[PDB]
Amino acid sequence: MNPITLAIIYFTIFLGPVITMSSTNLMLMWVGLEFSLLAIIPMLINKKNPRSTEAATKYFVTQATASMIILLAIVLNYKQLGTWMFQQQTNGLILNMTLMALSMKLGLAPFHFWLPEVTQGIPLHMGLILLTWQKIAPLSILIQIYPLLNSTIILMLAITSIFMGAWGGLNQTQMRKIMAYSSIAHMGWMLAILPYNPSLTLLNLMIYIILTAPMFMALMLNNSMTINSISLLWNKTPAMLTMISLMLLSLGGLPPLTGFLPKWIIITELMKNNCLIMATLMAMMALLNLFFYTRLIYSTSLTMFPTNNNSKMMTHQTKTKPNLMFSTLAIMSTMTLPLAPQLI
Amino acid sequence: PGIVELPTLEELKVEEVKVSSAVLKAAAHHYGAQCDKTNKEFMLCRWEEKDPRRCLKEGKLVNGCALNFFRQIKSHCAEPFTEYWTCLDYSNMQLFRHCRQQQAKFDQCVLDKLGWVRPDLGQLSKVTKVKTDRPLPENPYHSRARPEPNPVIEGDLKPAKHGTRFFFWTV
Amino acid sequence: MNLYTVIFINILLSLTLILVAFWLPQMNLYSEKANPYECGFDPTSSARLPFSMKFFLVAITFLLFDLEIALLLPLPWAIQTIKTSTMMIMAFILVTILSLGLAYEWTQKGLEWTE
Amino acid sequence: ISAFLKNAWAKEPVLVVSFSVWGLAIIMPMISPYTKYASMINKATPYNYPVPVRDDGNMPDVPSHPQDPLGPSLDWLKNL
Amino acid sequence: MPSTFFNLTMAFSLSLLGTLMFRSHLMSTLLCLEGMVLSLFIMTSVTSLNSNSMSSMPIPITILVFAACEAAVGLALLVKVSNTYGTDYVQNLNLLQC
Amino acid sequence: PFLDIQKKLGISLDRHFMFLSAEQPYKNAARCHAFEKEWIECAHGIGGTRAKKECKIEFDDFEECLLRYKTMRRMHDIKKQREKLMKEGKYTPPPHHSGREEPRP
Amino acid sequence: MFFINILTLLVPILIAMAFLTLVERKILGYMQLRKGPNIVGPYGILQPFADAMKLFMKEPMRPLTTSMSLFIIAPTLSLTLALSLWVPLPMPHPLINLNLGILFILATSSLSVYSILWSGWASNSKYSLFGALRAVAQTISYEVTMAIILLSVLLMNGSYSLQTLITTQEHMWLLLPAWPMAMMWFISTLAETNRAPFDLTEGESELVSGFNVEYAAGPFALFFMAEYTNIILMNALTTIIFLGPLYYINLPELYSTNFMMEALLLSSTFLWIRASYPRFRYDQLMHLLWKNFLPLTLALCMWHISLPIFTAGVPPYM
Amino acid sequence: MNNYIFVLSSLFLVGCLGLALKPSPIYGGLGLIVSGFVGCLMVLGFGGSFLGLMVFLIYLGGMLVVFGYTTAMATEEYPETWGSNWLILGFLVLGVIMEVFLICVLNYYDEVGVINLDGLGDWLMYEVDDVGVMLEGGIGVAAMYSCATWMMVVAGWSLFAGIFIIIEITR
Amino acid sequence: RMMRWNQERRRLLIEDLEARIALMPLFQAEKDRRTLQILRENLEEEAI
Amino acid sequence: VKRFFESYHEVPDGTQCHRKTYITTALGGICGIIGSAYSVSLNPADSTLEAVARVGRYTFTAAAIGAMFGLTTCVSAQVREKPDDPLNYFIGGCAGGLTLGARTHSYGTAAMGCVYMGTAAALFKIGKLEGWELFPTPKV
């Protein structure tokens, strides 16, 4: 690509969600979602291979139908009330159709079958964007209408996302799919609590971003896309094992790391409203979500694997890849539990 | 639940004009100068009060003033006026530029007799400050008494009592 | 009812004319005149195969320029507004941006055909 | 650069006219004195009825009839 | 008005059912998206004209704009699919599972 | 919204054509302007859960101005009864309902 | 009485198309140092009728490889649209007065493209497909310029109605303020109608009767007369928009006769243009009409936006 | 002439149905054109001219490119129109049957509110302004240049960026 | 020439719209009492 | 109709064995139809007959689960009169698991499903008995 094209496309990606936030009109929110859709595709398809073409096609076709369903909901609301804002006393069918379309946009189960494929079929960057910057505005729509939502199917979609993300990421050798299933489970955790104190949704979102972005950078630093490729890290970049370990053990919520904070306070604010046993199920399947992280950091850190003879050139040569924000994002994660009242 | 109060038929019976639109447009500019106080009082009734049922006599006065207008036209300047609107009706949009030699005749007749001067280009298109013995309408829209808003918490705030009551953080 | 009447009448004219064309003459049907022309000899293959077109990008940007036509076309109503400056600047921005996109396509050789 | 323009006016005159007319379209409204009258004419067109106002007794800048000396007089559109 | 709005809703539902239920081809799916767009346009415009809300009349034009942009990029990806597989069919996009 | 930038800057990019009773191009009232105005002025200062029960009369009036169901049902009942009477040989319509009247103006 | 007015609006236009055929042949002849038809009639005034009867007595063709539904319904669409376009024409008083007349024109013509484009597909042949794709490229070339030219032209009118231009041209033709717009509109009307130098669909020596090679009888006659009707239509539009004849509210027949003269001149110009030049290549056409006409069209749109304002010459709404 | 709008709506429904059955993009786009024409006609029936004409123009311009592409990429040796499949023909006929049956059902389950066959044509326009000027669509759409100057910016940027997006996808 | 002609047309339009202004109230009043007449007819019929 | 499945709780266990029985059977058949839809859409068969056989297998299996569950519950409430006792639901869940191991020929699945379904059904009765609310409304 050329600089003017990159400026245009990245500015459009920045303005998609930024339009979706600073917009009372739901039509302009839809416009922002379409901006994100339209501008992400040139970078999913920048390498021009069959995997990239398939990923971009699946993304486009899955997101356009959800956009059209959200537009159906908006048009029905305008017909009902003569207003471009979801008031109260709308129709539950409208609100549920909106919620299902947004679930298809995010990747929540049972609308999840497209995210691992697409994340596999693209570079390490544009998986980061796809999993972090594209989850925000769809979440903004829900955040703005959290009292209107059905507490039933919001939780069914959550629970299904947790179960399917854990059971998907359990058996994936490819890391681009493990991060996608992690995204699915974390979005389940968010959307479970979204009708209850929606600030915790944004908390879990920021935690998830601050974990995943360093992880995708770690995979970038040697173009790692497989367990057997991240296992050859004690020979190439052996100073990253510590942070990778602590961040994976944060993603799988464990106490002293800040990745247990979202699950903990989410279970708290659910137990305040008698969502006891659903919270128990989610907390218990988060362990199955943690199992493959444990296996992963075994494979790379604790039982260092066989290496190759050609990996010694890598030892001779030098690197410049860590961007000075890897350390910051990995250290604000894994170490910011005592600041939890300053987070909530 | 409540019923609509509608007038009766004889409360709507008027000496009406029974006159066409070309002949009406041909005299519009003088019907805006003469017969203006009644028209504008009717407009203020119809717009200040959003009920047609409360401006009926004003409409009848509009009709009567128009009748007197056309009768004063029928006493003097009937045939030039007939010529004017008869040429004017031939058009499809009822435009004035095609009938401009008859305007002069009609205006000269009605300026000699009855002393009516024609308004200029933009005189009929400005607010015109009518008075009336009526009272203002108290609460148009029949707005119900609004509910009182939720009260404001008065006070200059202080530290949180024992800091953050989170789980076990002291400060 | 007038426009509907006129269009129905033209439809009837065409259908009556085609009825005449098909049921007036004499026919001698057989497979050597009902098979496709292709200049004396028979087709080596079918016409219902992929036809590689070489102005597809120009077709897409024609679609976009038709949308820009749609955005520009309300101007005969826009000009009668009181501001006349917001619309002036916005029409200028719209046309200049369209022309800038056209210049980018031209320079990056999208208007050219895939040789 | 004058020679480059003298070239581009022989080779590719079409784009020269396009850029020149674009710049002219942008520049001439700034220069003309007749530009302000467009908004004023658009404002004078009375598509909607002018709703009268009640006489408080404190509206001396308003007329009490169409053909009075007061109000926005449209004598600039005439004999423009 | 209520009858035609119901029928437009059912038409959108049919186009949605279509674009969900795939066949071998893809452009048919894109055409179902276009039909959904058309039905939503008509519903919005009919509402604006019924309620006489002229301020919302800019909304259907924006719908058409962004929808034809969607069709444009879908057609670009269609070009790519053809260049790769040569046959436009959807059952060939089955190598991301591995 | 989520990021109330427009209030932070005072601008109104899109929050001046949210509802029907909002500044049509030439001042032509959208129908139910009065009802929507009334509902919105009753539900102000209040937020949501309380306006959903303290301004329900006004919302019902607006919902009946806009979607206009009770008048449909009323005229349907009237026409049903009229058809029944006319089939029973009891009711005949007057001159000014079969197309034979003295037009008013 | 509306049906009698439909007769007066329909049958003379068909006579005029049928005799534009003869006028074409004779003008091409005398431009080729020869005489056209003078045998069948006194000066060939019956050759169109001979042609028509011969076509409607030849056996048609329903080939085996084709799609009969499109094959038959496309000429219907072609004639129907070519004959419906004449309906809101003010000469000076139209049959159907529409407030969005030119939009009806544009939509009707862009649908008239589909006759060619479905006939060429239903005719399962290589040459028909060549012609259909060439028509696609042709429309993609000219429609943008058509719309924007007509926009910038009517920007000094105030409306899309065609009756309003008769008042806009009360004292002067619109050819003087906009001769470049008129130029590019003329060439657009030339690329439209698939007329020379932009034939490119019936490209005899490239595509041997493209979009028509499988059409023999009255179907081919339908396509032919649709072309020769849209020609007169486009010339009528040129002379209504630009070469505004004289209204004189007492005398509309003067408008009709001057309209007749000007449309005759413009149609004769079409034939003259055919006889003079060769054919373009249908990529040269797209390059020309995207790289010479569209930048200038946008610039003159800008100019005709600024021009009502800094002149205080905004037209009125009705 | 009261069932006009129900007829047009049902034809749009049938068009979208035959679309959803997904035959070749040729007949599919033909269905698109038919349904867009019908949508233009019903929007006219509700008093909207410009929006309908623009629907028809834009969809014609799109379906042209769709024909061009489907002759290049989405073509088979046997394009599989509607009648080619007894199954698709059965689904089409069943869809029409279910249209009729479901409309008859909704005409019974409720007196009125969803579908009103006895009361039809009475509820189309809803409070026209019988005296008016500068009232049509086109004024609202031209408000994109005044009082809605955000929609114009955002759509213009959409198209501008779409150009670059298309160039890079095709590169 | 077109500047001056459209300048005059924007004056004739002012004239015509002013005629419409002068005749707004008569049509308003007649329309009002006509609608009220029709509604009373409808009610007197509905009673029986 | 939601009332038809809420009528499971209008009279206690040990009463109206047949009503509760084919209520629960209808419930199991519903869930089996859902499972068959997901198993035929994703992972289709080589033919529509194989797909319909799959659907019938899943559906009648789940129906057997529900039938034995309801029968065993109302029986073990009828016998040993103790309707407010989740052990009856446990025994019924074990019968369900054993049927799952019968239709799917495996003793491991039998015991697995027995334990899991029994604990689940006992927890269900404890929820119905103590006032537990899955899918609660937001109150705080």
Curated annotation (Swiss-Prot), chain F:
Short name of one Pfam family: Ndufs5
Source superkingdom: Eukaryota
Region (Disordered): 78-105
Domain notes: Contains two C-X9-C motifs that are predicted to form a helix-coil-helix structure, permitting the formation of intramolecular disulfide bonds.
UniProt KW Membrane keyword: yes
Basic and acidic residues bias locations: 78-90
UniProt subunit comment: Mammalian complex I is composed of 45 different subunits. This is a component of the iron-sulfur (IP) fragment of the enzyme.
InterPro entries xref list: NADH_UbQ_OxRdtase_FeS-su5
Organism: Mus musculus (Mouse)
Protein name: NADH dehydrogenase [ubiquinone] iron-sulfur protein 5
Primary localization class, coarse: mitochondrion
Short sequence motif named Cx9C motif 1, residue ranges: 32-42
Its job: Accessory subunit of the mitochondrial membrane respiratory chain NADH dehydrogenase (Complex I), that is believed not to be involved in catalysis. Complex I functions in the transfer of electrons from NADH to the respiratory chain. The immediate electron acceptor for the enzyme is believed to be ubiquinone.
Family in the record: Belongs to the complex I NDUFS5 subunit family.
Keywords from the UniProt entry: Disulfide bond, Electron transport, Membrane, Mitochondrion, Mitochondrion inner membrane, Respiratory chain, Transport
Chain positions of motif Cx9C motif 2: 55-65
Any one GO BP annotation for this protein: mitochondrial respiratory chain complex I assembly
Its membrane topology: Peripheral membrane protein
CHCH domain ranges (all copies): 29-73
Curated annotation (Swiss-Prot), chain G:
Subcellular location: Mitochondrion inner membrane
InterPro entries: NADH_UbQ_OxRdtase_su1/FPO, NADH_UbQ_OxRdtase_su1_CS
GO MF, one annotated term: NADH dehydrogenase (ubiquinone) activity
Keywords attached to this entry: Electron transport, Membrane, Mitochondrion, Mitochondrion inner membrane, NAD, Respiratory chain, Translocase, Transmembrane, Transmembrane helix, Transport, Ubiquinone
Task performed by this protein: Core subunit of the mitochondrial membrane respiratory chain NADH dehydrogenase (Complex I) which catalyzes electron transfer from NADH through the respiratory chain, using ubiquinone as an electron acceptor. Essential for the catalytic activity and assembly of complex I.
GO cellular component assignments: dendrite; mitochondrial inner membrane; mitochondrion; neuronal cell body; respiratory chain complex I
Organism of origin: Mus musculus (Mouse)
Catalytic activity annotation: a ubiquinone + NADH + 5 H(+)(in) = a ubiquinol + NAD(+) + 4 H(+)(out)
Family as reported in the entry's similarity comment: Belongs to the complex I subunit 1 family.
Membrane topology reported for the UniProt record: Multi-pass membrane protein
PANTHER family (UniProt xref): NADH DEHYDROGENASE SUBUNIT 1, NADH-UBIQUINONE OXIDOREDUCTASE CHAIN 1
EC number: 7.1.1.2
Protein name: NADH-ubiquinone oxidoreductase chain 1
Curated annotation (Swiss-Prot), chain H:
Gene that encodes it: Mtnd6
Lineage: Eukaryota, Metazoa, Chordata, Craniata, Vertebrata
Free-text function comment from the UniProt entry: Core subunit of the mitochondrial membrane respiratory chain NADH dehydrogenase (Complex I) which catalyzes electron transfer from NADH through the respiratory chain, using ubiquinone as an electron acceptor. Essential for the catalytic activity and assembly of complex I.
Bilayer disposition of the protein: Multi-pass membrane protein
One GO CC term on file: mitochondrial inner membrane
Domain of life from the UniProt record: Eukaryota
Swiss-Prot/TrEMBL GO biological process terms: aerobic respiration; mitochondrial electron transport, NADH to ubiquinone; mitochondrial respiratory chain complex I assembly; proton motive force-driven mitochondrial ATP synthesis; response to cocaine; response to hydrogen peroxide; response to nicotine
Reactions catalysed according to its record: a ubiquinone + NADH + 5 H(+)(in) = a ubiquinol + NAD(+) + 4 H(+)(out)
Designated name of the protein: NADH-ubiquinone oxidoreductase chain 6
Residue ranges of the TM segments: 1-21, 38-58, 86-106, 147-167
Family: Belongs to the complex I subunit 6 family.
Quaternary assembly: Core subunit of respiratory chain NADH dehydrogenase (Complex I) which is composed of 45 different subunits.
Main enzyme class: translocase
Organism: Mus musculus
One matching Pfam family: Oxidored_q3
UniProtKB/Swiss-Prot annotation, chain I:
Places the protein is found: Mitochondrion inner membrane; Nucleus
Signal peptide extent: none
Complex formation: Complex I is composed of 45 different subunits. Interacts with CARD15, but not with CARD4. Interacts with STAT3, but not with STAT1, STAT2 and STAT5A. Interacts with OLFM4.
Free-text function comment from the UniProt entry: Accessory subunit of the mitochondrial membrane respiratory chain NADH dehydrogenase (Complex I), that is believed not to be involved in catalysis. Complex I functions in the transfer of electrons from NADH to the respiratory chain. The immediate electron acceptor for the enzyme is believed to be ubiquinone. Involved in the interferon/all-trans-retinoic acid (IFN/RA) induced cell death. This apoptotic activity is inhibited by interaction with viral IRF1. Prevents the transactivation of STAT3 target genes.
Similarity section: Belongs to the complex I NDUFA13 subunit family.
Protein name per the record: NADH dehydrogenase [ubiquinone] 1 alpha subcomplex subunit 13
Organism: Mus musculus
Classification lineage: Eukaryota, Metazoa, Chordata, Craniata, Vertebrata
Residue range from the parent sequence: 49 to 96 of 144
